[PDB]
Amino acid sequence: QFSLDQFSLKGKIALVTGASYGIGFAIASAYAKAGATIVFNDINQELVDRGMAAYKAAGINAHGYVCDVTDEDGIQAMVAQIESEVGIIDILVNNAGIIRRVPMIEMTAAQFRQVIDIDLNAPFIVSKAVIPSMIKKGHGKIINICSMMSELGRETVSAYAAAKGGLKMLTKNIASEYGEANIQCNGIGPGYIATPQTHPFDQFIIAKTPAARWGEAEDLMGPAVFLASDASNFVNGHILYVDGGILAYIGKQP
Amino acid sequence: QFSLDQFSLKGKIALVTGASYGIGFAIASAYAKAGATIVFNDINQELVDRGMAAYKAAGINAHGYVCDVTDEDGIQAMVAQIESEVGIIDILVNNAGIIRRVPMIEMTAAQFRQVIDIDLNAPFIVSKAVIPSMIKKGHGKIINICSMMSELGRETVSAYAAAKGGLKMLTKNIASEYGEANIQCNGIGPGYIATPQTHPFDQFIIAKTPAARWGEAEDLMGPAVFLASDASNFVNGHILYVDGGILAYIGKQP
Amino acid sequence: QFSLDQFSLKGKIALVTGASYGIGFAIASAYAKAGATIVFNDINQELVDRGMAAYKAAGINAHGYVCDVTDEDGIQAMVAQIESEVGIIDILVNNAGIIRRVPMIEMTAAQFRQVIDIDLNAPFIVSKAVIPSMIKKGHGKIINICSMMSELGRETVSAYAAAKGGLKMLTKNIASEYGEANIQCNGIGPGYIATPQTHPFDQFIIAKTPAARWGEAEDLMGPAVFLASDASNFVNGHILYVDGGILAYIGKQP
Amino acid sequence: QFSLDQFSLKGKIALVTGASYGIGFAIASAYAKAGATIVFNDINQELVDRGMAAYKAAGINAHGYVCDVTDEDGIQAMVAQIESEVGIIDILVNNAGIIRRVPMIEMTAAQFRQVIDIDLNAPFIVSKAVIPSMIKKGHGKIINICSMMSELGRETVSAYAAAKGGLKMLTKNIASEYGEANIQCNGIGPGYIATPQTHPFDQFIIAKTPAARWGEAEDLMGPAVFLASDASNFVNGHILYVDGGILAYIGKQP
Numbered sequence A, B, C, D: 001q002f003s004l005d006q007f008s009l010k011g012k013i014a015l016v017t018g019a020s021y022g023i024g025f026a027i028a029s030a031y032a033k034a035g036a037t038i039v040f041n042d043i044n045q046e047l048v049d050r051g052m053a054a055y056k057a058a059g060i061n062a063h064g065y066v067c068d069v070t071d072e073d074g075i076q077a078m079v080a081q082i083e084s085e086v087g088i089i090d091i092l093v094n095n096a097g098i099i100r101r102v103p104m105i106e107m108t109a110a111q112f113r114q115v116i117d118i119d120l121n122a123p124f125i126v127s128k129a130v131i132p133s134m135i136k137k138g139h140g141k142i143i144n145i146c147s148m149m150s151e152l153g154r155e156t157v158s159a160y161a162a163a164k165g166g167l168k169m170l171t172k173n174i175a176s177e178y179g180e181a182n183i184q185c186n187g188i189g190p191g192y193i194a195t196p197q198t199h200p201f202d203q204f205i206i207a208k209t210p211a212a213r214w215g216e217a218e219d220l221m222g223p224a225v226f227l228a229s230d231a232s233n234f235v236n237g238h239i240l241y242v243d244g245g246i247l248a249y250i251g252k253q254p
């Protein structure tokens, strides 16, 4: 018989990568509010300290680790520490990422490769590191933060789009390969999200979006909790777009 | 600040079409459990009486109406009655449908047209009938029950696939056209669902599905509540597949 | 060993529905230039006479018939006449269609149903009528003229989008069901095509399109010949978009 | 006015990467037959010598170079040599690739990264190297060899699927970013192709495929020539699947 308790993350541990601020912080905050214990990593101590204070201010007793997501040995060690200090990771959110804006033919091979490493290879490293324990626990969730660039291209973001497209298929592959072990791997694909770090451009976004507003990180919270919960146990290899209708809409024409 | 209350349908009224048994009944039951008031229709009194008893047995005080979903005048009148006797419909689930299995070249034009009328035209009639009041209430949800046949074809189900493909685009169109009025129109696309009314075929389904089991109507409840709730307010024109990984998977090969 | 002759339609007969002017005329003209014999239908004698003169002026000896595509008995009789007077139809292009622009809630059920009948049901009627002879000939092609509205919605075009979405799935279904009989059924999905019957709107289209121009009916000719030919024999249930990059592009932002 | 000459590659130079045997060789052979001058690269002299002899036997005067596609400096130098010895590359086919079959959690980070480097990063390197000259010539084509794994996952092929998914989005990005410079970048996505280097598995493939046969490299020739030619000039950011209907079909059930 259905219960709203199917949405609850009580008793579960979630690792959200790069969750010191922004979208990762918002998803982790919502997870905590839904009942979860929060663990997170970032590239330096300063960012970790920032996230730790922000969690504390929100009433959340988070566990923060310095670790590069592209460092497999580092990640494996971090997961080992989390398991001994906190418990088994039930839910992984691959949120850590970078973006570069550079005309493709101007982009150096090193810079292209670096965006691929963090945005595509790293979610494989982290997923790889958490999956064995999820299988033994008898249930896992892996939520990959995708993008509208998992679907559509744009000048200057070639590396990013290639990575997010790859991450979309990595999601479908993990679902296919580990679905039988009761791992659900899905994507959240944010539309246009109004960040601190961001008019004709405003009119442009508003026109493209049926909802007729920018999204906010708060719009991602419900969808992210749904995918981390028992309420989505038969949702697998699926990219949940949270874009107020952008991907469905040809656009507001004159 | 996030709350699990975003998943609650307390204080809301949902119309689920054809919800006397099966998947419609399961979605309506879950909606009631999530807090909603349930209204539903079916083609004859007998089916309505069946649904009414089943709701009562589940502890749900449902409101049932005899109405053909392809009868616009009938539907408009029914919505008028629901508004006077129960209240404004906040949530519509276009669940009523038929399927026929007939080689396409053997299918009569009347039979093709009939599957189209019920499975595609009727959800437009019903959506049309509820949208004006949703706009005035300041929020609406329309959930269209799609299919894997919204994406993939099969021998014998030409009319059904054409209808479900159409319903997929009708969903994206309603999102595009009414998203600005705070209507979210989305799809639920069930995978293989074990019904009462249904081994090498068993092996076939199990192999195709990463989850390695048939779905059940219970698997649709969490996804359907999510789409009817405030937790998905920035999800629009989106087809949520609930298939245990089928659409993501090339298949279990020898 | 590969030959460019794989693109040739020499010795083949093509039926293009509604091919008296516009996109249908351009596809039929190209088919004739590629070697094909052209047959076509339209709703009245006047349109047929128009197409007949235009073909003659282009050096093409076309065969024109008055027939409503929603009239199955009429279509079956027309195919019977074409078979006795011209030969077996090797290639069908479902091009005939209508569009209406009407806010969905303002659209009458009759008008919705009429767009569905012509744009979705009729291509099933016509496909049904040609498939038996294609199977006996040992090869058939059916090209369905889809739209960007097979993928994306817009205000005022609800019925049209629902039909084109349906037509997309009808294409995939015919492929699935008749592919084994050596029928290839595919779609052509035109982007923005500059028609006679059509500035900030100009800037809008140009920005949305990587190619940075309106498409023209001439842009559809190569893709349509490819799909009607031996060069695409292993292409089946596929929607070939011809849009200069629109569907791939998030858009030219400020 | 349409001509079949729109399919001709006369007067054009094509670079097909890794085209010493297999699918690359078949596409290059067809390109030569369509009128093109053939250049190709492979990882060692032995493979190059093999391709060179096979071209000669087919009546084709190919130009072969030893170059690793992941070596940007090497690729840039090779393109410089091709330009001085042969001419400007009008058409690039990113065909070079590797596949590994390894359960994801068993896959080393080095091996994952290597499949990504060759199958995703390398097509960016090669595209980057040819685009400036294409722009100056006033027309370019880039055809990326994708896969059904650009769309669907499977056990053991996580890295490959992630790369091909990425390559799909890289294609759409190049289209978006360089479409205005009259570059058309598209994908060919082969279905199941019977290779030398390859029964219940036979029954499995035959059932999944509406065409009810394995594909062959010859099935890719027409689609590949179409995408390299003037006949597809308004086709951009598009993945042309050549799979006999697999992606359109739910499967042949018992």
Ligand SMILES: NC(=O)c1ccc[n+]([C@@H]2O[C@H](COP(=O)([O-])OP(=O)(O)OC[C@H]3O[C@@H](n4cnc5c(N)ncnc54)[C@H](OP(=O)(O)O)[C@@H]3O)[C@@H](O)[C@H]2O)c1
Pocket (backbone or CB within 6 Å): A017, A018, A019, A020, A021, A022, A023, A024, A041, A042, A043, A047, A067, A068, A069, A070, A094, A095, A096, A097, A098, A099, A118, A145, A146, A147, A148, A189, A190, A191, A192, A193, A194, A195
């Ligand atoms: N509009 C949007 O914001 C938007 C839209 C769609 C999708 N997304 C995706 O949403 C996710 C997060 O978005 P956001 O904008 O809030 O944050 P964003 O700038 O990606 O940063 C995410 C976090 O990842 C961390 N990080 C970067 N590289 C790392 C590494 N190698 N190892 C460990 N941590 C690393 C960052 O540290 P630093 O402070 O040093 O960078 C940052 O704290 C990303 O996957 C992004 O691509 C964002």
Ligand SMILES: NC(=O)c1ccc[n+]([C@@H]2O[C@H](COP(=O)([O-])OP(=O)(O)OC[C@H]3O[C@@H](n4cnc5c(N)ncnc54)[C@H](OP(=O)(O)O)[C@@H]3O)[C@@H](O)[C@H]2O)c1
Pocket (backbone or CB within 6 Å): B017, B018, B019, B020, B021, B022, B023, B024, B041, B042, B043, B047, B067, B068, B069, B070, B094, B095, B096, B097, B098, B099, B118, B145, B146, B147, B148, B189, B190, B191, B192, B193, B194, B195
């Ligand atoms: N495996 C599955 O069951 C599956 C998988 C994917 C999608 N779906 C979709 O899920 C939805 C419901 O599935 P289901 O299998 O539980 O039920 P299903 O047999 O479609 O029946 C749904 C209800 O619709 C009613 N109905 C039919 N025509 C009507 C009309 N013209 N006016 C009003 N009501 C009408 C039916 O009455 P009757 O008893 O007289 O038919 C029945 O009570 C449908 O849209 C279906 O296409 C089902």
Ligand SMILES: NC(=O)c1ccc[n+]([C@@H]2O[C@H](COP(=O)([O-])OP(=O)(O)OC[C@H]3O[C@@H](n4cnc5c(N)ncnc54)[C@H](OP(=O)(O)O)[C@@H]3O)[C@@H](O)[C@H]2O)c1
Pocket (backbone or CB within 6 Å): C017, C018, C019, C020, C021, C022, C023, C024, C041, C042, C043, C047, C067, C068, C069, C070, C094, C095, C096, C097, C098, C099, C118, C145, C146, C147, C148, C189, C190, C191, C192, C193, C194, C195
């Ligand atoms: N921008 C575009 O033009 C565009 C873009 C994407 C897709 N398409 C699609 O391309 C196809 C043709 O486009 P178009 O703009 O050149 O022509 P369009 O106006 O659809 O007209 C096509 C032809 O269909 C005929 N027709 C309509 N209903 C019929 C019926 N019931 N029986 C027989 N014939 C009928 C029309 O006669 P009437 O003169 O009486 O209408 C006309 O000659 C259509 O499927 C359309 O939806 C067009």
Ligand SMILES: NC(=O)c1ccc[n+]([C@@H]2O[C@H](COP(=O)([O-])OP(=O)(O)OC[C@H]3O[C@@H](n4cnc5c(N)ncnc54)[C@H](OP(=O)(O)O)[C@@H]3O)[C@@H](O)[C@H]2O)c1
Pocket (backbone or CB within 6 Å): D017, D018, D019, D020, D021, D022, D023, D024, D041, D042, D043, D047, D067, D068, D069, D070, D094, D095, D096, D097, D098, D099, D118, D145, D146, D147, D148, D189, D190, D191, D192, D193, D194, D195
């Ligand atoms: N069933 C299929 O065959 C199938 C289906 C779908 C897609 N595809 C795709 O079609 C393309 C070619 O298929 P295929 O099976 O004929 O060949 P495949 O084994 O990928 O080999 C392609 C060629 O790429 C060369 N290559 C590998 N790494 C290279 C590098 N780093 N630098 C330069 N060249 C390199 C290979 O040399 P080596 O001999 O040393 O490996 C080989 O000659 C690939 O992109 C593949 O992923 C194949």
Ligand SMILES: O=C(O)[C@H](O)[C@@H](O)[C@H](O)[C@H](O)CO
Pocket (backbone or CB within 6 Å): A099, A101, A146, A147, A148, A149, A154, A156, A157, A191, A192
């Ligand atoms: O060029 C850009 O800035 C990108 O397109 C962003 O606007 C994306 O929308 C976002 O980073 C998606 O993930």
Ligand SMILES: O=C(O)[C@H](O)[C@@H](O)[C@H](O)[C@H](O)CO
Pocket (backbone or CB within 6 Å): B099, B101, B146, B147, B148, B149, B154, B156, B157, B191, B192
């Ligand atoms: O031929 C059939 O019976 C259909 O393919 C069903 O099995 C569908 O899976 C279901 O009705 C989808 O909506």
Ligand SMILES: O=C(O)[C@H](O)[C@@H](O)[C@H](O)[C@H](O)CO
Pocket (backbone or CB within 6 Å): C099, C101, C146, C147, C148, C149, C154, C156, C157, C191, C192
């Ligand atoms: O509202 C409109 O006029 C439609 O959106 C057209 O512009 C379409 O682009 C074309 O008819 C597609 O088939």
Ligand SMILES: O=C(O)[C@H](O)[C@@H](O)[C@H](O)[C@H](O)CO
Pocket (backbone or CB within 6 Å): D099, D101, D146, D147, D148, D149, D154, D156, D157, D191, D192
């Ligand atoms: O595991 C495998 O062997 C792969 O799935 C192949 O069968 C693919 O079909 C082909 O390599 C696609 O590119």
Ligand SMILES: [Ca+2]
Pocket (backbone or CB within 6 Å): A146, A147, A148, A149, A189, A190, A191, A192
């Ligand atoms: Ca985005």
Ligand SMILES: [Ca+2]
Pocket (backbone or CB within 6 Å): B146, B147, B148, B149, B189, B190, B191, B192
């Ligand atoms: Ca289904």
Ligand SMILES: [Ca+2]
Pocket (backbone or CB within 6 Å): C146, C147, C148, C149, C189, C190, C191, C192
């Ligand atoms: Ca269109």
Ligand SMILES: [Ca+2]
Pocket (backbone or CB within 6 Å): D146, D147, D148, D149, D189, D190, D191, D192
């Ligand atoms: Ca493949």
